[PDB]
Amino acid sequence: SMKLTIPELSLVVLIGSSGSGKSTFAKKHFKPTEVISSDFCRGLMSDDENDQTVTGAAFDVLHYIVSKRLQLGKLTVVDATNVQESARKPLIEIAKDYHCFPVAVVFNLPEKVCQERNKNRTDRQVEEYVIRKHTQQMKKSIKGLQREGFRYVYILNSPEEVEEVVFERQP
Amino acid sequence: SMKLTIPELSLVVLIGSSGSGKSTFAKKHFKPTEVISSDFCRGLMSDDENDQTVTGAAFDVLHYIVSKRLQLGKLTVVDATNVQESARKPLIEIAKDYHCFPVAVVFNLPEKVCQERNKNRTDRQVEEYVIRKHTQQMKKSIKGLQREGFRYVYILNSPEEVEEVVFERQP
Ligand SMILES: Nc1nc2c(ncn2[C@@H]2O[C@H](COP(=O)(O)OP(=O)(O)OP(=O)(O)O)[C@@H](O)[C@H]2O)c(=O)[nH]1
Ligand SMILES: Nc1nc2c(ncn2[C@@H]2O[C@H](COP(=O)(O)OP(=O)(O)OP(=O)(O)O)[C@@H](O)[C@H]2O)c(=O)[nH]1
Ligand SMILES: [Mg+2]
Ligand SMILES: [Mg+2]
């Protein structure tokens, strides 16, 4: 088993391409209310799943929901791709503002694993170019995560490592 | 600053090429008795400086001293190159046996930084091929550290980041 230590009051930032298994992971390890996803926040703005003008407002809504939860001292998991630095930066700022530890959990899986899961999804799919781009962005993000302000950086390098994770909420 | 969190019962394993600044780092951040260097244990075996004929014995003594400190529940920093898995593995096993968290602090500096510092050392110097080898070994080691059993893995990627380091002990 791979034991990942997280403080009782953390902002757990999931980082991974579409299809990397973020939401599945979040569901397996955390309570439903602890998880705030970008899909959920987009849904608050538009019942139209494919509306792109909504993304900006949806990020604002996600950041604000996270802020209020953390302000209440409630461990929160951000279930979004988070492969761009510009997406991670305000999350880290939020964590610092409410004196929480930002934790990075990176789904460092090969692009082919993500592409294959995507092809087999029955809930919703993305285009292949999206996952190609996400994976490149994820890879380029890894080295710099600690310096970005993540207090603990956990890189999961394979599906088996992902599957072996157990969180320890000691601190 | 770069805040690195360690539990008060930690085995802190410094990982880095000769000349990467491990001993300098250890002296800056820890008490002298918390730090056990391979050089010190070598000195217990031989009055000659950096005697290479007693290496096996020196590391045996290091392992023994480390395990006795952990046994007494004392935080210990292992100040050796630790760029080989075979050197790290017994430290991890010792930590496990004494219910201590092994922490990796990796000096991921460019080879040229270590080569350059080496030529200006007053205590002792190594040949260039040694530092080239150490650096290759260190870089190969990074990805697998968490899987090896290190609970926290902190990678320092430049002298500036090494400089900014502050430890936060959680007892
Ligand atoms: N076998 C296996 N399948 C998985 C695992 N994680 C996810 N999957 C499958 O991969 C598909 C996508 O997983 P999600 O958890 O939706 O991926 P995501 O990272 O949330 O994707 P986006 O929401 O598009 O960013 C699902 O159909 C899952 O069945 C896993 O650990 N093992
Ligand atoms: N300018 C500067 N010099 C440093 C720094 N850290 C170490 N040095 C110098 O680099 C040289 C080697 O540093 P050490 O701490 O002995 O390196 P080490 O990793 O212990 O090397 P070994 O014991 O041979 O494995 C010394 O001359 C230090 O003074 C630093 O942060 N800044
Ligand atoms: Mg999802
Ligand atoms: Mg030294």
UniProtKB/TrEMBL annotation, chains A, B:
Annotated positions binding Mg(2+) 1: 23
Residue positions annotated to bind GTP are 18-19, 21-24, 121, 124
Binding-site list for UTP: 18-19, 21-24, 121, 124
| Chain sites annotated for binding CTP | 18-19, 21-24, 121, 124
Which residues does ATP 1 bind? 18-19, 21-24, 121, 124
Which positions are annotated as binding ADP 1? 19-24, 121
* Residues annotated for GDP binding in this entry: 19-24, 121
Q: Where is Mg(2+) 2 annotated to bind?
A: 23, 79
Report the superkingdom from the record: Bacteria
Where along the chain is dATP bound? 18-24, 121, 124
Name of the molecule in the record:
Metallophosphoesterase
State the organism of origin. Answer: Acetivibrio thermocellus (strain ATCC 27405 / DSM 1237 / JCM 9322 / NBRC 103400 / NCIMB 10682 / NRRL B-4536 / VPI 7372)
Q: Lineage from the top down?
A: Bacteria, Bacillati, Bacillota, Clostridia, Eubacteriales
